[PDB]
Structure formats: structure tokens, C-alpha cells
UniProtKB/Swiss-Prot annotation:
The active site is at 12 (proton acceptor), 119 (proton donor). This is Ribonuclease pancreatic. It comes from the Eukaryota. It comes from Bos taurus (Bovine). It is an enzyme of class 4 (lyase).
Amino acid sequence: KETAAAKFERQHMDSSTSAASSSNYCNQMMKSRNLTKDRCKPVNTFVHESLADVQAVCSQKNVACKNGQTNCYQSYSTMSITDCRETGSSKYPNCAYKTTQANKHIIVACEGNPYVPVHFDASV
């Protein structure tokens, strides 16, 4: 099956653009990355950085994840992110999202060898 690392890339990475450039970004990306296939995923974050820069977070500041696990890491730098959140008019299969662009630190959970991000925990 798809690996956890590959799933993180599909769900969360967008190195092809520097920022969301229109209100339609989330609607397009949530659909194209197959996040709306079985249900409307309610929230999701995309990171507009190189993969290497995001993977490097696993070597940065160790912090507790929101659920208490201790394999989370916070980026030293802020990154360009886009938050996608379901709107009140969303109704499967026509899932609809509000796009919000921001510069925040990211918190990811890391696993494996090579030790790589497998879950997006928060932006702060």
C-alpha cells in the first residue's frame, strides 16, 4: 500500500507553488490529491516548501504532539502554508473549502529510517 511518508507528501506538500494564489486553491488541491474521494476531509494544511526543508524538521526542535506523543518536531523557521477548512456549503461529493494563506512554524510527527515526517500536527 501507500507508505506513511508518501501519504504525507500527497496530503501536505505543494513545492510547485510559493503560496495559494486564489480562493479556489483548496477546492482544487483537496480534489486533485484525492482527499475527498471517500468523504470531505474537514481540515488540511499544505506546505509550500521544498521536500528537503520539511524533512529536515525531524532534526529540529523536539516537542510533544497535541495528543502527547513525543515524536513531534517544530520547525525553527516559519514556512509558507495554506490552511483548508470545510465551509458550510460543503456537501459530499462537492466538498468545499475556505483557503487561508499564512507564514507559520510547522509541527510534524516523524517515524522510520530514514526518519521522515508522517503526520502534520499543527501550525503555530
